[PDB]
Amino acid sequence: SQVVRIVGVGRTGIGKLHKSVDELAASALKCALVDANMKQCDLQALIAVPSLASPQFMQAHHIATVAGLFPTKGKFIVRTVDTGGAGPITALGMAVDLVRTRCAETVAVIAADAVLSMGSGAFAERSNASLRRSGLPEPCIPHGYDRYAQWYMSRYGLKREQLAMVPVLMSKMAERHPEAMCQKAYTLDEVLHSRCVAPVTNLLECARRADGAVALIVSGEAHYAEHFAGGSKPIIASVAEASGPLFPPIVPDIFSCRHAARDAFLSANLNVGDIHFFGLYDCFPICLIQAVEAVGLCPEGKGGEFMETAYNEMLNNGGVLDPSKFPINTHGGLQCFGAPWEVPAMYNITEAIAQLSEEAGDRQLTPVPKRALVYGNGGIFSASSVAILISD
Amino acid sequence: SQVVRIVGVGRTGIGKLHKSVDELAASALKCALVDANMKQCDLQALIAVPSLASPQFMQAHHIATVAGLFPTKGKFIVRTVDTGGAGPITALGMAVDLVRTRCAETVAVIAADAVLSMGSGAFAERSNASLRRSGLPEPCIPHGYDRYAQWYMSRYGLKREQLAMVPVLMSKMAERHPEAMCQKAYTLDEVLHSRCVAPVTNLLECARRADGAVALIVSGEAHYAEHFGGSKPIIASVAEASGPLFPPIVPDIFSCRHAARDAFLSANLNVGDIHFFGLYDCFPICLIQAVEAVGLCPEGKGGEFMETAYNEMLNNGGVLDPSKFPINTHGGLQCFGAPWEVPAMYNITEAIAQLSEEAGDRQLTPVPKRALVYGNGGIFSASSVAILISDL
Ligand SMILES: CC(C)(COP(=O)(O)OP(=O)(O)OC[C@H]1O[C@@H](n2cnc3c(N)ncnc32)[C@H](O)[C@@H]1OP(=O)(O)O)[C@@H](O)C(=O)NCCC(=O)NCCSC(=O)CC(=O)O
Ligand SMILES: CC(C)(COP(=O)(O)OP(=O)(O)OC[C@H]1O[C@@H](n2cnc3c(N)ncnc32)[C@H](O)[C@@H]1OP(=O)(O)O)[C@@H](O)C(=O)NCCC(=O)NCCSC(=O)CC(=O)O
Question: Which of A69, A296, B104, B234 is in the most buried spot, having the most CB atoms within 10 Å?
Answer without folding.
Answer: B104
